[PDB]
Each structure stands twice: as structure tokens, then as C-alpha cells.
């Protein structure tokens, strides 16, 4: 027999689950520099930002299949007056054509993550993470004593758990628009490209399985186009 929500208890759960403001009024600023590919352009764009104390999150130099032309998607935080200041500093550099502002534009943000995830369960990962920690103590026996730890399971199991975990990770990866590119005897490698916040969500959901290696890189950006219907385009004045 499955119980049902009460008319009152339902409302109580909603307002209790409704999250408090967990974000600043400021937003994710995105600047896209158009630079000339001269020897040392990377070192001076970074140097200009680092020497003036700007909280940058990524840089990412992108080729554009045009000779001697590159573009950098810079992501930073701060006030509008600070970002515009940071923008004008970079643009003043002579190998820089222009620095576009995407902080208020419909863009497509893309990070690329590659991570090897263990299939041997949480117990083994907890053991492995403790083993490599001891460098430069009775827990090693406490972990290897837990249930569902490989050493405490038959050979038919674990094999059945590895593929069960593999199915879970694959289903997580598929739903996020990713793919499993490698399947090891004890692990697997996933590949995912989406929004930076969507990557963070994926790397949190797949975290309990155990992330052996990881490579997140940075965010790339390309402007979308806000298309509206002919009755919403006629909504002028």
C-alpha cells in the first residue's frame, strides 16, 4: 500500500525544498578577444590580466581556421565597471583587434570533460584514495572490512557490480549528451561537452562512483540568435 500526500503536508514540503538565494546578484561575465597570432600573444594577454588582479576563471585560446587569427574566451567575475575596465585593458594591446562582451548576450557555452571513473565501487575508491594519501593508519583495515568491498565478495559478484556501475555511469553520461569512449577491466572513460554548470552537475552525480582522473579545460563561446515569432516581433512599443 502506497501512501499519498496530504493537502497540507504537500505545501509544507514544497516551501521547505524551495532553495534560498544561493547566488550573487552578479553574473558570469564572458569576454571574447579577437587577437593576432603573433609570437607571445598568449603570454601578454595573461600577463596583463594577472598583473592587475582580475579574478579570471578560464582563458582558452581557440583557432578559427583563418591564417594568423585566434580568439580567447575569457571568463571572470566582478562589477560591470571592473569587467569593462578589464576589457579596455586587453583591447588596448596592439595584437588585439577587439574584445567582445558576451555577458549579456545569448551565447553557447561549452566545456569539455574527460574523466576516468572506477567501477569497483565506493569501498575500493575509498581504499585507493587512502593508499595514495600516505606520502610525504588503522583505517586501511576498517575500509577493507566493509560490505560490498571487492575483497569481501565472491568472484561472480564485483564483475556483476562493475557492469551495474558501468550501466549507471553510461546512463548518466547519455542523459547529459556524453559518451563512454573507453571501457577498462576496472574502470571507464567518459567524454562530455556542455554548459560549465551542466558539467559541474555531471561531475557531482558521477562523483560517488570515484573519479580517478579528470580534465575539465575551460569554456568556449559562440553567439546564438534569439528568434521570436512574427507576432512577438510586432510587439514594438
Amino acid at each position: 500500500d502506497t501512501p499519498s500526500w496530504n493537502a497540507n503536508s504537500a505545501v509544507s514540503s514544497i516551501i521547505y525544498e524551495t532553495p534560498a538565494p544561493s547566488r550573487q546578484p552578479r553574473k558570469q561575465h564572458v569576454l571574447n578577444c579577437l587577437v593576432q597570432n603573433e609570437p607571445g600573444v598568449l603570454s601578454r594577454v595573461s600577463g596583463t590580466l594577472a598583473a592587475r588582479g582580475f579574478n579570471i576563471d578560464s582563458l582558452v585560446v581557440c583557432n578559427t581556421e583563418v591564417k594568423d587569427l585566434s580568439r580567447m574566451t575569457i571568463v571572470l567575475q566582478g562589477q560591470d565597471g571592473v569587467i569593462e575596465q578589464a576589457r579596455r585593458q586587453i583591447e588596448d594591446l596592439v595584437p588585439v583587434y577587439a574584445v567582445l562582451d558576451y555577458t549579456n548576450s545569448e551565447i553557447i557555452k561549452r566545456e569539455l570533460v574527460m574523466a576516468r571513473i572506477s567501477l569497483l565501487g565506493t569501498e575500493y575508491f575509498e581504499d585507493l584514495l587512502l593508499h595514495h594519501h600516505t606520502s610525504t593508519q588503522e583505517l586501511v583495515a576498517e575500509i577493507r572490512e566493509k560490505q560490498f568491498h571487492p575483497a569481501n565478495l565472491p568472484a561472480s559478484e564485483v564483475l556483476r557490480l562493475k557492469h551495474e556501475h558501468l550501466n549507471d555511469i553510461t546512463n548518466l553520461t547519455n542523459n547529459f549528451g556524453g559518451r563512454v569512449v573507453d571501457i577498462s577491466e576496472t574502470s571507464c572513460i567518459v567524454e562530455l561537452s556542455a554548459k560549465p554548470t551542466r558539467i559541474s552537475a555531471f561531475l557531482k552525480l558521477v562523483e560517488p562512483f570515484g573519479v580517478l582522473e579528470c580534465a575539465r579545460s575551460g569554456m568556449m563561446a559562440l553567439p546564438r540568435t534569439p528568434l521570436k515569432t512574427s507576432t512577438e516581433e510586432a510587439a514594438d512599443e
Binding site: 497540507n8 505545501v11 509544507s12 516551501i15 521547505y16
Partner: protein, 602 residues
Amino acid sequence: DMDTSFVGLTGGQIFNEMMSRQNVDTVFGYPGGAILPVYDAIHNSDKFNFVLPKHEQGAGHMAEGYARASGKPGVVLVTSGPGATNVVTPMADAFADGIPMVVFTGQVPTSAIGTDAFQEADVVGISRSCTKWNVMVKSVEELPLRINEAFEIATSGRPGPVLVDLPKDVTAAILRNPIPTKTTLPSNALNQLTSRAQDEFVMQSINKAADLINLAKKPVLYVGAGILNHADGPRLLKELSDRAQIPVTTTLQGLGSFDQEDPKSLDMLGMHGCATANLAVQNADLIIAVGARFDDRVTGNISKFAPEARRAAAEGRGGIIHFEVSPKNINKVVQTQIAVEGDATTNLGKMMSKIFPVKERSEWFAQINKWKKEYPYAYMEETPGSKIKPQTVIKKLSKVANDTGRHVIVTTGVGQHQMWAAQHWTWRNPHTFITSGGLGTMGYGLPAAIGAQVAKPESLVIDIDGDASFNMTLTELSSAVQAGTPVKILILNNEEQGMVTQWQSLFYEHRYSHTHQLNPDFIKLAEAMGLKGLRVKKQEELDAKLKEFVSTKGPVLLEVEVDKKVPVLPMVAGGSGLDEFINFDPEVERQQTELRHKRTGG
């Protein structure tokens, strides 16, 4: 949990018992076809009284006065069709001024609803926007529940009108099974879980409220009718004006909450409020709103309302503190700096003693008392060789009625007489002023005066009504002599619509378009209604008639012929601020008198 004490009784019989369970001792209303099963049960009832009018609009207004006088919800029991639609106006009045009342209207049988049945009307849909809550009782099982829900909502938070439709087939049916009796309000589900969060919110805001109080250099206690919704309301009001030495101004519906015999009183503000109060608000650095909603008749112009208080807000010197029971009225007109949600009385009691008592504010009270000296209720006082001035009639009656040693309750209509009755009359003791402000309904004077005496039979009720307003509900004269209510009716007859003619003279070049109605012979009207009628033409006759009326045993009528075209002053109208008022001047009043005749000729 369910009840079982209504098993065997019809819907009407249940209604009769619910009156005693809800402490109702008076029920107004008018019989009808669809409400017959209810009246058959309340026949010679031993639970309550029944005041029977002759128009459903009267019964609604009688319930408002009955509520404002005592403090109990007014009950209206009318029929369906036209009998229910005649209760729309008093419900709209009760919705604006916030008057607690539960209106029970009849209805066609449920099997006939939606068939354009005889005397069928979408009362639920019609009265939806002018009631806090309404419901149509589908089954006799719901009737004991919906009544308890109606009365609770009508008394919870800000008091207001609620309507309950009673179909004939529901009131005629017999309850044969146990029913839930206690209410099911969704507002309680939220406030229970969010109790501590709200409890800490109002306390931490009170601390901040008491902080800016101690920073105030020229504070003003801005009070409304919200303080009158509690017994110890005015009691805690004066004890804050005494402690922190704060001058007190009040709104039309809040009048009586502060005895203006107190040296700290500024009394009424607003469009027709005294210049002393309007200037005090404008020059205040901290305004403490106690149970007011900042009406447009009060603020004059939002763009320039309380400029010094807005200055002190940006400087952190003062601002506006708002004691409010319903968060819907916070920051809907003007933006406050501190919000204290809840009953103003209980909130002040917790903010009290966290405030620093003051000895005296020398400079602030000096300019205030100086404002009384140069800006009082100045008007053209009558000369021995002239017709009776209306303003002085109130001021005369003010002392005459008060020196009788009785409890005096004043009820007015809507017009110039309404303002003049609030300006000159001294308001000692709370719940003594009952009028219509939010909606401003004419013909509200007489019925409310009748119902107010039903709640307070020992008290002396006096109806200061106007001729145009009295003409709307002069029908309810023979109801006062049937309900045994010795009401005192005063008619400041100017033979015109003064409040409208005033606007037509200032903004429409003295073009009086259909503002002169043909008044009947009031003295013979009262005699026709079996009521004592009196008149007064000359000035010297007034002093004898006023003492004759207030001492008259039983219902009496008083008609005073007053002057023509007398503008209520001071006036704050148009795009003017409260400090930009139109002051009185006997010379510009003379010019306006002579130039009026030239544009008229009669």
C-alpha cells in the same frame, strides 16, 4: 473530529443554533421565498434579536454600525434575487473600511441553479470582488462548517465582509449524519510551519523600529483605524505618545482613538484635515504608521508626501515605520523603511519599554502649537444679520450632547457635513465615530445610527446627516420606531449637494449640473413615519432646538437650514501636496460669493 449535535435538525434549525455558538445577539435581514426554510426556524427565536428594515441595503448598513459600535460581526439574513443584490453596496462599504460582517443570502434550489431560475442571481460571482471570502453551501453537511469559516475570516487579520449563499433545498434538508465542525484554513498551515521565522522577523524588526525612534528629532504618530480593532488599542496609543512625547495625527476612520484634549494631538490630516496636521507630517523626519493604509485622501500627492521623512531616510536619520496586519498594504502606496507585521496594539506592547522616555521636545512642539495659532479650523463664522453657518452647528452640538453625561456615538453620511462633523467635534473615548470613508456611501448615516444603538442601547446615538444623503435612506425611519431605537437624527439641510457643488465651483467655473434635488418636508415626513420632527430657520432658535433634541425620549428629527455654497477648508486637491493646502480667507470667500451670483443670476 466530528460533531453530532445537529442530527435531526433541518438546515434552518442548524443556522439558528450557529448564532448562539458564535455569540450573535442581533440579526438584521429581510424575508423572502428562497430563504423561507431559515426564517421558519428562527421564528420567535430565543438566541438573538431581529431588526426588520424595509430595504436590504438598510440591513447591511445597520450591520456595519452594529459592528463599529460593539466590535462583533454584523449579521445579515436576506433572500435571493434582488434581496441579495441590494446588499452589494454595504458589502463594498464594509470591504473598504474593513467592517466585520457575515452576510447570509438565500438562493434557488441547487437543482435550479444555472437555469435562469426565479430570483436566481450569481451572488457568489457578483460579491466576489467586494468580499474577503464567499461560498455557496452545497449540502447541509457543510453548513455548520462554512458558517464557522465565514465568521473566522471576517474577524481574522483585517476585519471584512463575507457572504454565504443558502439554497432552499439545503436549508430544508435534514442532517442525518455526523459532520466536521472546526474550520480548515490553509493560512493556518503556512503560519504554523513558518511561525518561528515570522516570530523572529517581527521581533528583530521591532528592535530596529525602536532604534530609529530614539534617533527621531521631530517624530509624528500617524494613526489609522487599525488601532481601534483592539480593546487596549487607544490605551497603548496614548502611553506611547506620553512616553516618547510624540504628537499624534489621525485619519477619518481612526478618529476617537486619541482624545484631542491632550496637548500632543494634531487630530485629522488629509484632503480636508487641519493644516496643523498636514504640515506636521511634511516636516516630520520619522513617521510611525499605526494601522493606516495611506489613502489618496490622506496623502494628497504621493510625489511630494512627507519630504523631510524621505530626506531622513536617505540620511539614516529617520524614515517611515509601518505597523501593519496585512502585508498587502505594505509598500503599495509609499515605500517604508521598517515593516512590523501583525496587530498594531500587540506590536506596540512589545516595542514598548525598548523605547527611551522623553521629558519634552521644546522646539518641535513649539512650532506645532504655533501652527494651531496661525492655522486652525478657520471659517466664516455667522453674523447676527446672516443665515446659520453649518460649521458652528457641529461645534455647538459637540458640547451639548457631551454634557448630558451619556455615552455619545456619532454617525454621519457623506459630504461637507461629514467633514465638518469630524473637524470641530471633540473626540473623547474610542469607537464613538462611525462613518463611511473608503467607499463613501450616501444614506449611510441613518441605518448605521440605528444599528449602532442596537449594540449600545444605553448610549446616545446621534446622526449628523446631509439632505442629499438622507434622501437615499429616509425610508428606514419607521424601522427605528419598530426596533425601539431612540435615534437622534440631524439634517444640515443646505438644499443642495455641497460636496459636489464645492468641486464644481473651484474646478468647473460654478457650473452646477444637476446637484440640486427637491427635498421633501422632513418635519412632516417624520410625523408620517411616527417620529418627532423639529426644524429651525433663524439663528436664535438653534440653541433651544439642540437641547430639545438630545434630551428627547424616543426617535427625533432635527433639521437645520444652513448657508449656501460653503467650501470645506482647508483643502488639499489636484496635484498639490499636503503643505500646499487651500487656506481659508473671508475676502476671497466674498469674491467667490459675488462672482458666483454673476455666473448664475439666481
